[PDB]
């Protein structure tokens, strides 16, 4: 659940989305930023997904973000070969792993949860 904030008019650009549930001033609004960048050789495009979730707190009557939750993701969408089943397999496996082991990812625990 994220709504649009800024969507590049080109297929290769940077789109920004804001989180829905959070009710804070929009400067400290949690965001997800997708960014496609083309290789100089034109061999692949890199897809970048950056989530920042500022933890807003109040000190001396001011809004400051003592800590911030960040999550970065990158993918090499190769343009020199179409192996679409394999690219989808990579994305599916990483998504499946995050969903399954989410409970321990949030705790800094590499062990499988079962």
Residue numbers 38-67 binding a copy of itself by CB under 8 A: 38, 42-47, 49, 51, 53, 55-64, 66-67
Q: Is 110 in the site for a copy of itself (CB under 8 A)?
A: yes
- Least CB distance to a copy of itself at residue 20 (A): 9
Site track for a copy of itself across 7-26, x = CB under 8 A: xxxxxxxxxxx-x-x-xxxx
Q: Is 27 in the site for a copy of itself (CB under 8 A)?
A: yes
> How far, in Å, CA of 45 to CA of 18, rounded?
24
> How far, in Å, CA of 114 to CA of 85, rounded?
28
> How far, in Å, CA of 69 to CA of 36, rounded?
22
Question: Which of these, 4, 1, 11, lies nearest to 35 by C-alpha position?
Answer: 11
- Least CB distance to a copy of itself at residue 104 (A): 7
> For residue 99, how many other CB atoms are within 10 A of its CB?
9
- Least CB distance to a copy of itself at residue 98 (A): 5
- Least CB distance to a copy of itself at residue 19 (A): 7
Q: Is 79 in the site for a copy of itself (CB under 8 A)?
A: yes
> How far, in Å, CA of 15 to CA of 37, rounded?
12
């Amino acid at each position: 659940s994220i709504t649009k904030y800024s969507e590049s008019a080109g297929p290769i650009g940077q789109s920004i989305y804001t989180f829905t549930g959070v009710t804070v001033p929009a400067q400290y609004m949690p965001r997800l930023v997708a960014t496609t960048t083309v290789n100089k050789a034109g061999t692949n495009i890199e897809y970048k997904i950056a989530v920042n979730y500022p933890l807003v707190s109040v000190v001396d009557g001011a809004n400051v973000a003592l800590n911030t939750i960040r999550a970065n993701l990158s993918f090499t969408a190769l343009q020199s070969v179409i192996n679409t089943d394999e690219k989808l397999r990579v994305l599916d496996e990483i998504v499946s792993f995050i969903t399954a082991n989410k409970a321990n990812i949030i705790d800094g625990n590499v062990l499988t949860v079962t």
